[PDB]
Amino acid sequence: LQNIIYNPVIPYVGTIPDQLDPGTLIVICGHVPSDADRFQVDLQNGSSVKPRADVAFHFNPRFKRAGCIVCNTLINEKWGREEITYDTPFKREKSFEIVIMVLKDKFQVAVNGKHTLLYGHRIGPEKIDTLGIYGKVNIHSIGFSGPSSG
Numbered sequence: 001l002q003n004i005i006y007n008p009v010i011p012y013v014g015t016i017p018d019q020l021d022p023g024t025l026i027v028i029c030g031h032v033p034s035d036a037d038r039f040q041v042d043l044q045n046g047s048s049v050k051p052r053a054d055v056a057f058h059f060n061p062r063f064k065r066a067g068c069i070v071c072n073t074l075i076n077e078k079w080g081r082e083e084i085t086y087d088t089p090f091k092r093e094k095s096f097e098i099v100i101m102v103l104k105d106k107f108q109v110a111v112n113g114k115h116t117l118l119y120g121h122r123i124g125p126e127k128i129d130t131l132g133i134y135g136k137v138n139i140h141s142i143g144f145s146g147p148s149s150g
Ligand SMILES: OC[C@H]1O[C@@H](O[C@H]2[C@H](O)[C@@H](O)[C@H](O)O[C@@H]2CO)[C@H](O)[C@@H](O)[C@H]1O
Pocket: 058, 060, 070, 071, 072, 079, 082
């Protein structure tokens, strides 16, 4: 991988190395803390806190009850329609590997080598230049792979 970040402190907010052109991969390896309630991975347009930066893609695994993954987009500080995935591969006290592939019309996400969900772009991905990770989660590494990697 390229531009790897190891054991980052959460909350984590860092500029992404390259434009997320179709085919780009975002690999995030971590572990879910005991009794974690939730955590999130946000692909943002900037790092402004106020006004809060738009979130092109909000990937938010929730663990209470049966557990799920909520995906949404924040525009001008307003959340849009939630897209919920009820078949979540995340579990407390277990490690994980998240692979987000940026396609032309959507994001494709796989966890632990298994397809998990799709999310159509609401904001042009070229507007994303910042990665944010918040919540109860331990991140081991963050890596990026461009479309022409090899
Ligand atoms: O949509 C992502 C956004 O959800 C907020 O919580 C929502 C909740 O998921 C929804 O079921 C309820 O109707 O409205 C709540 C907001 O008022 C989270 O608080 C926010 O951090 C994001 O995760």
